């Protein structure tokens, strides 16, 4: 997160840290969508040209966290994963289309002041909120810039940008499974997700019911916070049928 600020305690209680067992390191963000499932970006898990291919035995997830490095006794939980599931039509060869993955916990996690899932959206909540200019929120322990690493979860609020603008500012092929978001140079304000933020959530608060919904997943960008450029996010509602299909059959 670049030009963000410190999260407040409990501000983002579905926020999840994807964590390599050995060597120990922060891999990505992720999110708690129920007591049994974490949501993330595929390129967090599998990216064959960099020899990325993390099985479940390789990772842990840490939930409830605030500080980046500290072990937060009496606040965080740590869980082993049962299984990973990457979108089968995930396109790493070109543009990271369908850059989504599911992860199933071995044990259901207990909720608390710090551990609470977020909603996924319905068609309506999708229609209503996914609009040029409407703002959402990205949280992450990623790079402060393109020192370095933050001490605590960082937050920034960003406007959704209209498809033509998004399309016309990268030379990569946008699919309808992506959206982009960030401010434009003439809008003054700054802000972007960065390395280490991948896989973490882009949320919006519905004014119909007061719930936070995850409309996006940090997927990619070119550098971080560069003028005329934008963060790309994985359109979660577009892929929601695969999300449910996976849960219904492996939710157990």
């Amino acid at each position: 997160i670049v030009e963000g600020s410190d999260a407040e305690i409990g501000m983002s209680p579905w926020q999840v840290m994807l964590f390599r067992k050995s060597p120990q390191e922060l891999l990505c963000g992720a999110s708690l969508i129920s007591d049994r499932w974490v949501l993330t970006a595929a390129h967090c898990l599998l990216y064959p040209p960099w020899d990325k291919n993390f099985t479940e035995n390789d990772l842990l997830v840490r939930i409830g966290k605030h500080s980046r490095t500290r072990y937060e006794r009496n606040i965080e939980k740590i869980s082993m994963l049962e299984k990973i599931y990457i979108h089968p039509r995930y396109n790493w060869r070109e543009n990271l289309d369908r850059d989504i993955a599911l992860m199933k916990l071995k044990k259901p996690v207990a909720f608390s002041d710090y551990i609470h899932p977020v909603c996924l959206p319905d068609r309506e909540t999708a229609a209503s909120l996914l609009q040029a200019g409407y703002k959402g929120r990205v949280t992450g322990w990623g790079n402060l810039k393109e020192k370095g690493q933050p001490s605590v979860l960082q937050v920034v609020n960003l406007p959704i940008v209209e498809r033509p603008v998004c399309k016309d500012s990268t030379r990569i092929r946008i699919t309808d499974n992506m959206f982009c978001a960030g401010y434009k140079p003439d809008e003054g304000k700054r802000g972007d997700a960065c390395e280490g933020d991948s896989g973490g959530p882009f949320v919006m608060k519905s004014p119909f019911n007061n719930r936070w919904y995850q409309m996006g997943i940090v997927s990619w960008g070119e550098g971080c916070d560069r003028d005329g450029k934008y963060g790309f996010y994985t359109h979660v509602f577009r892929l929601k049928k695969w999300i449910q299909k996976v849960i219904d059959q492996f939710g157990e």
Partner: peptide, 6 residues
Amino acid sequence: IFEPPE
């Protein structure tokens, strides 16, 4: 450096 659990 990351602080250990248990």
